[PDB]
Amino acid sequence: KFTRSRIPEKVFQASPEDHEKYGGDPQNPHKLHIVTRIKSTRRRPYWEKDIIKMLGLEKAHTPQVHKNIPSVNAKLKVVKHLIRIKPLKLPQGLPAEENMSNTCLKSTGELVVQWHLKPVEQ
Amino acid sequence: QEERERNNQNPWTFERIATANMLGIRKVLSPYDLTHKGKYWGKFYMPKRV
Amino acid sequence: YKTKPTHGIGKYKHLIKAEEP
Amino acid sequence: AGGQWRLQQGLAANPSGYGPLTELPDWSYADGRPAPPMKGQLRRKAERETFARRVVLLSQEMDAGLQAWQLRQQKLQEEQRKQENALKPKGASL
Amino acid sequence: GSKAVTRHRRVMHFQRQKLMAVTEYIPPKPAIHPSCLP
Amino acid sequence: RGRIPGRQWIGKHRRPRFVSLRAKQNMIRRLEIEAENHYWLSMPYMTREQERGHAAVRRREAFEAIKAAATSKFPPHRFIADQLDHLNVTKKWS
RNA sequence: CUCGGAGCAGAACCCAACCUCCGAGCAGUACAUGCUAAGACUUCACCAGUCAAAGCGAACUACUAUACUCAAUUGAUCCAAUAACUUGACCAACGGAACAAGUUACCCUAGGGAUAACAGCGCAAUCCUAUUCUAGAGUCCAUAUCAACAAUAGGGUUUACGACCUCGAUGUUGGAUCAGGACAUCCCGAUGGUGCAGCCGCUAUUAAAGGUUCGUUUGUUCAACGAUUAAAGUCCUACGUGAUCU
RNA sequence: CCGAGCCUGGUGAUAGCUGGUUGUCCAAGAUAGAAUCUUAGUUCAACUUUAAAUUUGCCCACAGAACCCUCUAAAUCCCCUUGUAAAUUUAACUGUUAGUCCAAAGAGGAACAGCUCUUUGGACACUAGGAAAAAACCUUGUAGAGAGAGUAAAAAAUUUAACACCCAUAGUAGGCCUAAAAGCAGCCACCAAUUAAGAAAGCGUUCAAGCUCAACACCCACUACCUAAAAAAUCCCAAACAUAUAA
RNA sequence: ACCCCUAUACCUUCUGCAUAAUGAAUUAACUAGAAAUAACUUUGCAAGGAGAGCCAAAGCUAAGACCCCCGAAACCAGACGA
Ligand SMILES: [K+]
Ligand SMILES: [K+]
Ligand SMILES: [K+]
Ligand SMILES: [K+]
Ligand SMILES: [K+]
Ligand SMILES: [K+]
Ligand SMILES: [K+]
Ligand SMILES: [K+]
Ligand SMILES: [K+]
Ligand SMILES: [K+]
Ligand SMILES: [K+]
Ligand SMILES: [K+]
Ligand SMILES: [K+]
Ligand SMILES: [Mg+2]
Ligand SMILES: [Mg+2]
Ligand SMILES: [Mg+2]
Ligand SMILES: [Mg+2]
Ligand SMILES: [Mg+2]
Ligand SMILES: [Mg+2]
Ligand SMILES: [Mg+2]
Ligand SMILES: [Mg+2]
Ligand SMILES: [Mg+2]
Ligand SMILES: [Mg+2]
Ligand SMILES: [Mg+2]
Ligand SMILES: [Mg+2]
Ligand SMILES: [Mg+2]
Ligand SMILES: [Mg+2]
Ligand SMILES: [Mg+2]
Ligand SMILES: [Mg+2]
Ligand SMILES: [Mg+2]
Ligand SMILES: [Mg+2]
Ligand SMILES: [Mg+2]
Ligand SMILES: [Mg+2]
Ligand SMILES: [Mg+2]
Ligand SMILES: [Mg+2]
Ligand SMILES: [Mg+2]
Ligand SMILES: [Mg+2]
Ligand SMILES: [Mg+2]
Ligand SMILES: [Mg+2]
Ligand SMILES: [Mg+2]
Ligand SMILES: [Mg+2]
Ligand SMILES: [Mg+2]
Ligand SMILES: [Mg+2]
Ligand SMILES: [Mg+2]
Ligand SMILES: [Mg+2]
Ligand SMILES: [Mg+2]
Ligand SMILES: [Mg+2]
Ligand SMILES: [Mg+2]
Ligand SMILES: [Mg+2]
Ligand SMILES: [Mg+2]
Ligand SMILES: [Mg+2]
Ligand SMILES: [Mg+2]
Ligand SMILES: [Mg+2]
Ligand SMILES: [Mg+2]
Ligand SMILES: [Mg+2]
Ligand SMILES: [Mg+2]
Ligand SMILES: [Mg+2]
Ligand SMILES: [Mg+2]
Ligand SMILES: [Mg+2]
Ligand SMILES: [Mg+2]
Ligand SMILES: [Mg+2]
Ligand SMILES: [Mg+2]
Ligand SMILES: [Mg+2]
Ligand SMILES: [Mg+2]
Ligand SMILES: [Mg+2]
Ligand SMILES: [Mg+2]
Ligand SMILES: [Mg+2]
Ligand SMILES: [Mg+2]
Ligand SMILES: [Mg+2]
Ligand SMILES: [Mg+2]
Ligand SMILES: [Mg+2]
Ligand SMILES: [Mg+2]
Ligand SMILES: [Mg+2]
Ligand SMILES: [Mg+2]
Ligand SMILES: [Mg+2]
Ligand SMILES: [Mg+2]
Ligand SMILES: [Mg+2]
Ligand SMILES: [Mg+2]
Ligand SMILES: [Mg+2]
Ligand SMILES: [Mg+2]
Ligand SMILES: [Mg+2]
């Protein structure tokens, strides 16, 4: 019978080789996720369809930010085959009230607080 | 056979993908495939599978 | 329960000689 | 075509995504007066702002939650010290 | 349909069939063939 | 002369299907994406103990809005002007 | 054909087959198995069924004593019997119609390819063929020839199975007529082997251009028989072909 | 036009059965079972729809849920947090209750079926792309216009059987058994001559002869020690290509 | 205009129909959803409502809004027919 899958915890234990490959820092884990759905929920069990709705991933290729906490990660582990998970990067820190309207999320996962639409002078 | 599994240069193995439910592959696999690891299909045994 | 670590705590027939005429 | 190359340069895979080719105004008045913002760009500006505010809201909740947990741990440590004090022992030890 | 165990080799699902092809054994390939070295 | 008994893709005897070169590459490409997802789920920012209760206030207030909207259902107000304006259908020039 | 236990259904519940097994239509002991009443369970509805603290009244200061032991151990309404209490069906087709069997090819109507006979299709148990294996037979000799126990493939001609198309119709044997095709070749051609002297044969490779009889009996396909022939081949074609015929 | 006439009337007989059922637009919408002279139907549940009330619903952390027993199964139940926005109750009803394939755990058959029966999930009975055509596999869903753009799934690979050369005397026809057994029908031993050769590994002879192998010598045979085919009936079946920087 | 590219009529019935399942030559005309019980919605009046009856522990009165067509073989009565 096809039932829900229990993923062993050994799968989610990063080796030192993995850290070098992906550049993550285990001592400074990223605060937020960037979850994007890249696979259809059709031809998948209903519990995967429901979790996608809970995460706000109804529309594919639409980035969504979620907190890097065990409860949120538990939902991600169920539909990890339908999504792309990337860490959110803040080169200039969190957006402030002054630059709320000048933010953009680049394809590299970086949220830039200034977006001038001009070439760099350097 | 143990040597073949040790020096296997393929980054992807049946055991790793099936146990981790990668790609949702367990929707087309069997619960016995968690322990057979792709070496057995029905009554048939495939010695070349690693 | 089976999955719990306390599985089989109530087993007693393995301590008794099998009397099956 | 060339979606992967654009990703390697930090650009959007689809050229219609973020960038000067899309977000810049398509036209302006001949005398130089700027045109009103395009309705598509207004939708993206509002959608980006909500995403930016959600990032701040999630970050502040985790920061506040971490402080609350740390505050509880500090409070728990102090409670153990107070219970140690009691009446002076007597009897055999005196 | 057919049961889990069949006398003939049952046709695998295409998703499973692609998994078998991807996870084939790849023997290590030396940079220089051993017969070409002393 | 070569025909598949019954339907092609169902039954005991099926038309064989073979994995092309690009079929393998597509599966490997998606396998690499999921492998990176495993890495980013291995480093939670907070533990389960620290996470507890950090968003209870917002969640409770969010549901109170749902309750408020659910219990606010009522017929709309009715105005005299709306009823009287129907007399304008026979308005004529003098 | 109703009810209960176990497997299928391995761990909360549930879960079918004209599925695999074992049983029930009682018995025994009490005579407070008296009355009443929170909160619950429930056989996937309902009906029905199940457990119950407290309290009243008893028992009791020995009695695993307080809703008997026991798994199922059973039947609604109406109605009938009775002063009352209460009782009454193998209504077993067991949610039960108060009481009604055969036959129809003399048949009719409404439908159904939701469902059989016909053909197609699926399948290959059965049937057929090849190869692998080398016990045995062939005086000796496994492989001239034949072949056991088994193994791996293939064919879709037999008998079955399934019920997918057709019941606001897809007309059945055999024959006549015309034949199309397959080769797993009966004859004719070309070859290998032989337990091939020759003459006749056996076996295998290759070959589908050509040919493959007339009659007695039988509705016959067959089969038996007569006389021949270089030979009187095996099958498919909606068991080829009835808007061509019988 | 008689298994019992015909006409009229009851009669608009009845039909769980078949057929048909008329303007535009949008929205929600595929559903465990139980009983039934019942399985071609109905009623109650379930599911679905509308309106309404007010409050948790779903996803789930530990802790927790059986002994008997062969599979020490995949899992489930419970469940705060969290991510989410639904859920229950009240009022009023209809329809669905003749199911198909795929994956998985099983049962029946033949470890047959496009077979049959359950369970978990998917898809179909809705869109579009792909696997050639294609309900059931893959990709993908929320709707319009565009002579823009990035992508998803998405093309079938493979071609196999050479092999050594050279050389051989002898105790002795070992004993026993046996008509005969002489290396080679059985039994026992399996010692020894020659630098070198088993009281004989495979053939052969009625028994013996006879032909090989294991010996010496010569000498770099300086070997792979992983395997195997084909046949159907109208007419093969896209055309083709081994070479220009992986997109 | 055609040539190019794309496209398996419709209704019904079904698990599923281009289906070689059903009906249809075509035109015009004719030919098929009738209502209580409550409930809902909108007025009136209000512990009363209603133009005797009836209902009423916010009810009551009034209105709006839901329920098809064709077809048997038969049965019976009374006539008419050798
Ligand atoms: K088939
Ligand atoms: K009955
Ligand atoms: K069969
Ligand atoms: K028929
Ligand atoms: K011929
Ligand atoms: K005759
Ligand atoms: K019926
Ligand atoms: K001898
Ligand atoms: K029709
Ligand atoms: K019909
Ligand atoms: K057809
Ligand atoms: K049809
Ligand atoms: K027909
Ligand atoms: Mg199965
Ligand atoms: Mg076909
Ligand atoms: Mg059980
Ligand atoms: Mg259940
Ligand atoms: Mg119940
Ligand atoms: Mg009591
Ligand atoms: Mg009954
Ligand atoms: Mg019952
Ligand atoms: Mg009755
Ligand atoms: Mg007769
Ligand atoms: Mg009659
Ligand atoms: Mg009839
Ligand atoms: Mg049928
Ligand atoms: Mg049926
Ligand atoms: Mg017929
Ligand atoms: Mg048939
Ligand atoms: Mg036919
Ligand atoms: Mg076959
Ligand atoms: Mg012999
Ligand atoms: Mg011989
Ligand atoms: Mg066989
Ligand atoms: Mg046939
Ligand atoms: Mg069937
Ligand atoms: Mg017809
Ligand atoms: Mg004929
Ligand atoms: Mg012919
Ligand atoms: Mg031939
Ligand atoms: Mg041939
Ligand atoms: Mg000739
Ligand atoms: Mg010769
Ligand atoms: Mg015929
Ligand atoms: Mg004809
Ligand atoms: Mg005929
Ligand atoms: Mg007459
Ligand atoms: Mg009628
Ligand atoms: Mg009837
Ligand atoms: Mg809709
Ligand atoms: Mg009855
Ligand atoms: Mg029914
Ligand atoms: Mg639940
Ligand atoms: Mg909860
Ligand atoms: Mg109803
Ligand atoms: Mg079926
Ligand atoms: Mg289903
Ligand atoms: Mg239907
Ligand atoms: Mg297509
Ligand atoms: Mg869209
Ligand atoms: Mg000697
Ligand atoms: Mg001797
Ligand atoms: Mg001899
Ligand atoms: Mg010897
Ligand atoms: Mg000799
Ligand atoms: Mg030699
Ligand atoms: Mg061609
Ligand atoms: Mg083409
Ligand atoms: Mg076309
Ligand atoms: Mg049908
Ligand atoms: Mg079609
Ligand atoms: Mg036609
Ligand atoms: Mg038609
Ligand atoms: Mg019909
Ligand atoms: Mg007409
Ligand atoms: Mg009406
Ligand atoms: Mg009405
Ligand atoms: Mg009619
Ligand atoms: Mg009568
Ligand atoms: Mg009469
Ligand atoms: Mg007369």
PDB file of N, CA, C and O (backbone and C1' of nucleotides) in Angstrom, chain G residues 34-50:
ATOM      1  P     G G  34     -34.971 -10.570  39.458  1.00  0.00           P
ATOM      2  O5'   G G  34     -34.736  -9.275  40.355  1.00  0.00           O
ATOM      3  C5'   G G  34     -34.860  -7.974  39.803  1.00  0.00           C
ATOM      4  C4'   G G  34     -35.684  -7.073  40.689  1.00  0.00           C
ATOM      5  C3'   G G  34     -35.786  -5.621  40.252  1.00  0.00           C
ATOM      6  O3'   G G  34     -36.752  -5.413  39.237  1.00  0.00           O
ATOM      7  C1'   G G  34     -35.267  -5.708  42.549  1.00  0.00           C
ATOM      8  P     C G  35     -36.469  -4.362  38.056  1.00  0.00           P
ATOM      9  O5'   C G  35     -36.641  -2.943  38.753  1.00  0.00           O
ATOM     10  C5'   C G  35     -37.885  -2.556  39.315  1.00  0.00           C
ATOM     11  C4'   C G  35     -37.746  -1.326  40.175  1.00  0.00           C
ATOM     12  C3'   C G  35     -37.192  -0.089  39.490  1.00  0.00           C
ATOM     13  O3'   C G  35     -38.160   0.608  38.726  1.00  0.00           O
ATOM     14  C1'   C G  35     -36.093  -0.396  41.552  1.00  0.00           C
ATOM     15  P     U G  36     -37.740   1.320  37.349  1.00  0.00           P
ATOM     16  O5'   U G  36     -36.776   2.504  37.801  1.00  0.00           O
ATOM     17  C5'   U G  36     -37.260   3.570  38.604  1.00  0.00           C
ATOM     18  C4'   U G  36     -36.134   4.369  39.212  1.00  0.00           C
ATOM     19  C3'   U G  36     -35.228   5.096  38.234  1.00  0.00           C
ATOM     20  O3'   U G  36     -35.781   6.317  37.781  1.00  0.00           O
ATOM     21  C1'   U G  36     -33.912   3.969  39.839  1.00  0.00           C
ATOM     22  P     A G  37     -35.416   6.878  36.322  1.00  0.00           P
ATOM     23  O5'   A G  37     -33.956   7.483  36.499  1.00  0.00           O
ATOM     24  C5'   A G  37     -33.699   8.496  37.459  1.00  0.00           C
ATOM     25  C4'   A G  37     -32.220   8.678  37.684  1.00  0.00           C
ATOM     26  C3'   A G  37     -31.392   8.923  36.437  1.00  0.00           C
ATOM     27  O3'   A G  37     -31.432  10.274  36.017  1.00  0.00           O
ATOM     28  C1'   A G  37     -30.353   7.261  37.752  1.00  0.00           C
ATOM     29  P     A G  38     -30.659  10.731  34.688  1.00  0.00           P
ATOM     30  O5'   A G  38     -29.190  11.052  35.200  1.00  0.00           O
ATOM     31  C5'   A G  38     -28.131  11.247  34.280  1.00  0.00           C
ATOM     32  C4'   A G  38     -26.902  11.787  34.961  1.00  0.00           C
ATOM     33  C3'   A G  38     -25.704  12.006  34.058  1.00  0.00           C
ATOM     34  O3'   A G  38     -25.776  13.222  33.338  1.00  0.00           O
ATOM     35  C1'   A G  38     -25.019  10.835  35.979  1.00  0.00           C
ATOM     36  P     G G  39     -25.947  13.197  31.743  1.00  0.00           P
ATOM     37  O5'   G G  39     -24.515  12.750  31.214  1.00  0.00           O
ATOM     38  C5'   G G  39     -23.332  13.304  31.767  1.00  0.00           C
ATOM     39  C4'   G G  39     -22.199  12.312  31.748  1.00  0.00           C
ATOM     40  C3'   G G  39     -21.847  11.739  30.388  1.00  0.00           C
ATOM     41  O3'   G G  39     -21.046  12.611  29.613  1.00  0.00           O
ATOM     42  C1'   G G  39     -21.985   9.988  31.959  1.00  0.00           C
ATOM     43  P     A G  40     -21.046  12.483  28.015  1.00  0.00           P
ATOM     44  O5'   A G  40     -20.243  11.137  27.751  1.00  0.00           O
ATOM     45  C5'   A G  40     -20.599  10.260  26.695  1.00  0.00           C
ATOM     46  C4'   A G  40     -19.982   8.901  26.895  1.00  0.00           C
ATOM     47  C3'   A G  40     -20.047   7.960  25.707  1.00  0.00           C
ATOM     48  O3'   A G  40     -19.035   8.216  24.750  1.00  0.00           O
ATOM     49  C1'   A G  40     -20.727   6.811  27.648  1.00  0.00           C
ATOM     50  P     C G  41     -19.358   8.098  23.184  1.00  0.00           P
ATOM     51  O5'   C G  41     -19.251   6.537  22.892  1.00  0.00           O
ATOM     52  C5'   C G  41     -18.088   5.809  23.256  1.00  0.00           C
ATOM     53  C4'   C G  41     -18.351   4.326  23.282  1.00  0.00           C
ATOM     54  C3'   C G  41     -18.872   3.722  21.990  1.00  0.00           C
ATOM     55  O3'   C G  41     -17.846   3.464  21.049  1.00  0.00           O
ATOM     56  C1'   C G  41     -20.176   2.949  23.798  1.00  0.00           C
ATOM     57  P     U G  42     -18.017   3.930  19.523  1.00  0.00           P
ATOM     58  O5'   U G  42     -19.155   2.972  18.955  1.00  0.00           O
ATOM     59  C5'   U G  42     -18.967   1.566  18.901  1.00  0.00           C
ATOM     60  C4'   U G  42     -20.261   0.850  18.621  1.00  0.00           C
ATOM     61  C3'   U G  42     -21.036   1.330  17.404  1.00  0.00           C
ATOM     62  O3'   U G  42     -20.549   0.800  16.186  1.00  0.00           O
ATOM     63  C1'   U G  42     -22.505   1.144  19.236  1.00  0.00           C
ATOM     64  P     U G  43     -20.615   1.677  14.843  1.00  0.00           P
ATOM     65  O5'   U G  43     -20.707   0.592  13.684  1.00  0.00           O
ATOM     66  C5'   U G  43     -21.845  -0.254  13.560  1.00  0.00           C
ATOM     67  C4'   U G  43     -21.491  -1.557  12.888  1.00  0.00           C
ATOM     68  C3'   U G  43     -22.677  -2.432  12.490  1.00  0.00           C
ATOM     69  O3'   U G  43     -22.349  -3.148  11.299  1.00  0.00           O
ATOM     70  C1'   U G  43     -21.309  -3.607  14.015  1.00  0.00           C
ATOM     71  P     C G  44     -23.174  -2.898   9.943  1.00  0.00           P
ATOM     72  O5'   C G  44     -23.154  -1.318   9.755  1.00  0.00           O
ATOM     73  C5'   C G  44     -21.988  -0.654   9.278  1.00  0.00           C
ATOM     74  C4'   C G  44     -21.734   0.632  10.025  1.00  0.00           C
ATOM     75  C3'   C G  44     -22.587   1.823   9.596  1.00  0.00           C
ATOM     76  O3'   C G  44     -22.841   2.651  10.730  1.00  0.00           O
ATOM     77  C1'   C G  44     -20.304   2.335   9.288  1.00  0.00           C
ATOM     78  P     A G  45     -24.202   2.490  11.567  1.00  0.00           P
ATOM     79  O5'   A G  45     -25.246   3.391  10.775  1.00  0.00           O
ATOM     80  C5'   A G  45     -25.072   4.796  10.681  1.00  0.00           C
ATOM     81  C4'   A G  45     -26.294   5.455  10.100  1.00  0.00           C
ATOM     82  C3'   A G  45     -27.580   5.277  10.891  1.00  0.00           C
ATOM     83  O3'   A G  45     -27.693   6.200  11.960  1.00  0.00           O
ATOM     84  C1'   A G  45     -27.986   4.818   8.608  1.00  0.00           C
ATOM     85  P     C G  46     -28.058   5.690  13.437  1.00  0.00           P
ATOM     86  O5'   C G  46     -29.586   5.257  13.330  1.00  0.00           O
ATOM     87  C5'   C G  46     -30.588   6.192  12.962  1.00  0.00           C
ATOM     88  C4'   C G  46     -31.847   5.493  12.518  1.00  0.00           C
ATOM     89  C3'   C G  46     -32.405   4.465  13.487  1.00  0.00           C
ATOM     90  O3'   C G  46     -33.186   5.044  14.516  1.00  0.00           O
ATOM     91  C1'   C G  46     -32.320   3.534  11.321  1.00  0.00           C
ATOM     92  P     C G  47     -33.054   4.509  16.023  1.00  0.00           P
ATOM     93  O5'   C G  47     -33.737   3.072  15.985  1.00  0.00           O
ATOM     94  C5'   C G  47     -35.101   2.921  15.624  1.00  0.00           C
ATOM     95  C4'   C G  47     -35.425   1.490  15.283  1.00  0.00           C
ATOM     96  C3'   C G  47     -35.066   0.461  16.343  1.00  0.00           C
ATOM     97  O3'   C G  47     -36.022   0.372  17.382  1.00  0.00           O
ATOM     98  C1'   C G  47     -34.285  -0.279  14.248  1.00  0.00           C
ATOM     99  P     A G  48     -35.547   0.444  18.914  1.00  0.00           P
ATOM    100  O5'   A G  48     -34.541  -0.781  19.067  1.00  0.00           O
ATOM    101  C5'   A G  48     -35.014  -2.118  19.003  1.00  0.00           C
ATOM    102  C4'   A G  48     -33.925  -3.080  18.605  1.00  0.00           C
ATOM    103  C3'   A G  48     -32.862  -3.370  19.650  1.00  0.00           C
ATOM    104  O3'   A G  48     -33.276  -4.301  20.631  1.00  0.00           O
ATOM    105  C1'   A G  48     -31.817  -2.933  17.589  1.00  0.00           C
ATOM    106  P     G G  49     -32.804  -4.126  22.157  1.00  0.00           P
ATOM    107  O5'   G G  49     -31.237  -4.399  22.109  1.00  0.00           O
ATOM    108  C5'   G G  49     -30.729  -5.648  21.667  1.00  0.00           C
ATOM    109  C4'   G G  49     -29.242  -5.587  21.437  1.00  0.00           C
ATOM    110  C3'   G G  49     -28.400  -5.199  22.639  1.00  0.00           C
ATOM    111  O3'   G G  49     -28.190  -6.264  23.548  1.00  0.00           O
ATOM    112  C1'   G G  49     -27.704  -3.942  20.785  1.00  0.00           C
ATOM    113  P     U G  50     -28.146  -5.963  25.125  1.00  0.00           P
ATOM    114  O5'   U G  50     -26.740  -5.251  25.334  1.00  0.00           O
ATOM    115  C5'   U G  50     -25.540  -5.892  24.933  1.00  0.00           C
ATOM    116  C4'   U G  50     -24.334  -5.037  25.214  1.00  0.00           C
ATOM    117  C3'   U G  50     -24.228  -4.474  26.617  1.00  0.00           C
ATOM    118  O3'   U G  50     -23.775  -5.417  27.569  1.00  0.00           O
ATOM    119  C1'   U G  50     -23.757  -2.772  25.064  1.00  0.00           C
TER     120        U G  50
END
